[PDB]
Amino acid sequence: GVPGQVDFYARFSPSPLSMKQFLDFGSVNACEKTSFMFLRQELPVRLANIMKEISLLPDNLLRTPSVQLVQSWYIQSLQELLDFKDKSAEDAKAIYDFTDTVIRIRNRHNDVIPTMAQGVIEYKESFGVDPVTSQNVQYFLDRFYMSRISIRMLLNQHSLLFGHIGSINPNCNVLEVIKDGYENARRLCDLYYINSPELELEELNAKSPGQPIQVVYVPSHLYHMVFELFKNAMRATMEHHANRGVYPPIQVHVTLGNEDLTVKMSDRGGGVPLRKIDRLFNYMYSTAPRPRVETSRAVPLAGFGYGLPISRLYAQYFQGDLKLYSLEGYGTDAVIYIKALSTDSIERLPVYNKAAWKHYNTNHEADDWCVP
Amino acid sequence: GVPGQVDFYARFSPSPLSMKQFLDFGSVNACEKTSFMFLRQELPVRLANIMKEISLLPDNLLRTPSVQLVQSWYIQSLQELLDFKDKSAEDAKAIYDFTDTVIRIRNRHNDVIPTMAQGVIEYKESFGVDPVTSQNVQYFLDRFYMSRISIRMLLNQHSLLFGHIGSINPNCNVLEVIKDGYENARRLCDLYYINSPELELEELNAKSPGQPIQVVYVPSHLYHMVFELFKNAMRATMEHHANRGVYPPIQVHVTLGNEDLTVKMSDRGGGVPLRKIDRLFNYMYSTAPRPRVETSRAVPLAGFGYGLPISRLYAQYFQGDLKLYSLEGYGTDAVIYIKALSTDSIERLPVYNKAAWKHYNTNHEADDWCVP
């Protein structure tokens, strides 16, 4: 029945699109029939591939009310999409009903990321950290959230085009997005610490010096990354210098190279030893019950969610990256790497196959080197 | 015969030592009998483990005159060590003959690193890059050179103690080593580019502010790392700014934290795109015929050897690291991480076993993600 439908579409691989393909589609032609033909196969494929991995979760995580709800959302969206498998692209009502279904699914899935995060909280609350499964949880959540980002991208594009090119800005003003992230992080910082660091912004357009720095990008993806990084930099700065009462600025250097757009953000917030860096990207370590609604107390800036690992997934989604390197006792740099060329910006998508299944059913240990 | 001896000792795992163990040994007791008992087993074990992996090299690399010579050196040293397997620690002549043999082996192996590098040159000259084997060559050379570093360490300690604690300085003055590396790199830089960048050095002893920064370390290991990094930073700076004729300084920030000693080196040498960073640590990409003897022309600063990957192996040998991160179009940071505590500084050693053998006989590809 439903397992048969999931198995049929999970056999296929997701088909990654480049940023240029996204852009070229909705610019001139903007054919709703073309989007239909692509999505009536691609959305089921992407839903079914990730649904096979939901089923491999540790039972105590799978059985949580929040994961069960997310899975039921995916099952329902998949079934609604499969009703168009045999309908005709020339059937105008079918096209109309499909665009309507895309919008319905988009709203149904609006809360997937925090609901999944709620399931990890429920799991951690009632069973604790399990070192065997916890490697599988980290593997799953990277892939589930990257998958969700890609599905969200497809739904948003179709919804905006048929309900700036979709959510893509062909001329994203990088420094304006950065200032926007700074000001919103600073507002939260003032509310919590009653003070905040200044911003020092430097830019270099090596490609065309003195010219504004723009790229083809999804602005909300860039906003999410820099906003989350600013909150982490500010938290570290405010807590490390609380005794002094003088707070060093946060420095940002933006560079457009022949190939890389890089955003480097630097703080003097006291740093982190190298041994402790990676837990900042670990979902289980970052999982804590969420701030309560019934209080006027300010919300903490960082350490209370998945802002950082999800930021890195945004960077990696279009073949970029997000790296942290810290000098313990001094401060920390974060570097966002983005492809400067739209033709290099290709979706990075997980695929369910024997290799993926093997990851859930194997111990991963470096037995060819001596134990440290 | 000889294959039987190698197989017997390659069954064992190398036994890593901490920096504290190295230091505690040669400080007070300094028992030559104790060193004998340890080394008459540990040296054969470490030689035989790496010799099994020499035999797995691509035939066209194994058969080069330089690799054949290195292998014959290892075979001869192994056989000379095995003559003590049944001799008594109380036999004073046996102790004396063993210390004599350690010194002989140390000198015989003085040229292992450049001779192995000569074999890669010979291999690359006559057969080209082979994409299937080239992954195995990278895997082997990391392990062979890390193994050599560890064997060199044991030979040096025994030779210095029984021929400052050996080559270990319990009070290594980090900034003095750094200035030494700077001045020697600057000398080579002036010879090639007829100019050179200045040094700007900053230090922070977060552990004990204003106090000199010292750690237990092998000074020549630290020298090698910073000297190689300076040469790379200077090369990039001199070539990127050759048009301007004004050369920005190289900035170094040294920090001693509760856990990490970090050395950050920064240049404004124009940077490297992220896609091209890793080839800087790739032996096959870095392999070029060496500068000829018969010339007065200055030797190029970087790009002509294995200084950089071997520097990172030095850092990782005692559980540190060496990382590069660049902003394409602007410049590059290198960060050395060293354990601030001698008890955390444990040898990182390769071990020959089924896992190691499997690496040479498998294709390594990320089939659980879509091809970029």
Ligand SMILES: CNc1cc(F)cc2c1[nH]c1ncc(C(=O)NCc3cncnc3)cc12
């Ligand atoms: C650009 N800045 C930036 C970006 C970012 F994504 C994360 C951080 C960051 N700056 C940070 N400073 C400190 C921490 C931290 O983990 N602090 C806890 C810690 C410290 N010392 C010993 N044990 C634990 C994290 C960040």
Ligand SMILES: CNc1cc(F)cc2c1[nH]c1ncc(C(=O)NCc3cncnc3)cc12
């Ligand atoms: C601390 N500085 C530092 C340390 C280090 F270990 C290595 C480097 C370095 N600075 C560098 N700058 C440039 C390069 C390079 O690979 N240049 C070639 C390149 C550039 N642009 C496009 N394609 C290729 C390498 C380094």
Ligand SMILES: [K+]
């Ligand atoms: K599949």
Ligand SMILES: [K+]
């Ligand atoms: K072994």
